Design a protein around this ligand. Structure first.
Ligand SMILES: *C(C)CC(=O)c1ccc2cc(OC)ccc2c1
Length: 247
């Protein structure tokens, strides 16, 4: 990985030591990017629901992950499951249980820094993985994208700025999540997010992290060409709100 500081350095070093899982995948690869395009065609707002046991906002909500997943199976284009253990209190066992419980695409949301974590995702039933430009060398990012693709998974590449986009496009990214977030405050700079979106080629499937989890923000971004939306963990408090967000 890149050299990093603070808790991010800690979690990346912890992730390098993540024990691998020996398991047989229990389900097909259910492509997230393709389902997004299908929703676009059908004119259905495509929202990726996000589950994390512990939220960085400090407002943790008690929600049974299986109940949440089964509810979201009816509305969401896919699920993002935070599997990092130390700070977010996720687990591989939770991912496995969720994957065995629903038939919609599952994104393994973790700090992916080695090949065995992609093996883990595949073996556990995840349909794709997040790769984060800001924690990986370009060589690592390219190699991990290739490794995920070898499995039949199109990784979601997280970009935060123009530098990240330049690297992502060079290494062949076709499925990109646009944050443009101040890491220190957890706040999206909507102006910068929109500039980044405008720089992305038309043949890339685009997922925006919502800075404001409301229908107005979604409508504005969809007009700018965004294909799907990663919503806040706050939706765990009232899952039903996703009905409003989707129309
Ligand atoms: C969880 C797998 C992703 C997450 O929590 C996180 C934390 C910090 C961070 C910093 C970035 O740039 C400095 C990019 C992504 C990212 C993701």
């Amino acid at each position: 990985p890149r050299y990093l500081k603070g808790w991010l350095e800690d979690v990346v070093q912890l992730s390098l030591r993540r024990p691998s899982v020996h398991a047989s995948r229990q389900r097909p690869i259910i492509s997230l990017n393709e389902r997004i395009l299908e929703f676009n065609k059908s004119n259905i707002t495509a929202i990726i629901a996000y589950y994390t046991r512990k939220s960085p906002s400090g407002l943790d909500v008690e929600r049974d992950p299986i109940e949440y997943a089964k509810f979201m199976e009816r509305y969401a284009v896919g699920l993002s499951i935070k599997t990092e253990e130390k700070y977010f209190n996720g687990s591989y066992e939770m991912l496995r249980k969720i994957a065995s419980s629903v038939s919609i695409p599952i994104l393994m949301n973790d700090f992916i820094v080695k090949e065995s974590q992609i093996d883990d995702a595949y073996n556990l039933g995840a349909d794709t993985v997040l790769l984060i430009v800001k924690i990986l060398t370009e060589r690592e990012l390219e190699s991990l994208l290739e490794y995920a693709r070898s499995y039949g998974m199109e990784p979601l590449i997280l970009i935060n700025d123009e530098n990240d986009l330049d690297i992502a496009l060079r290494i062949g990214a076709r499925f990109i999540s646009i944050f443009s977030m101040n890491f220190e405050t957890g706040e999206i700079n909507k102006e910068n997010q929109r500039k980044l979106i405008s720089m992305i080629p038309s043949n890339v499937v685009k997922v925006a992290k919502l800075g404001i989890s409301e229908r107005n923000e979604i409508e504005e971004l969809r007009k700018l060409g965004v294909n799907a939306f990663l919503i806040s963990s706050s939706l765990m408090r009232n899952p039903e709100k996703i009905k409003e967000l989707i129309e």
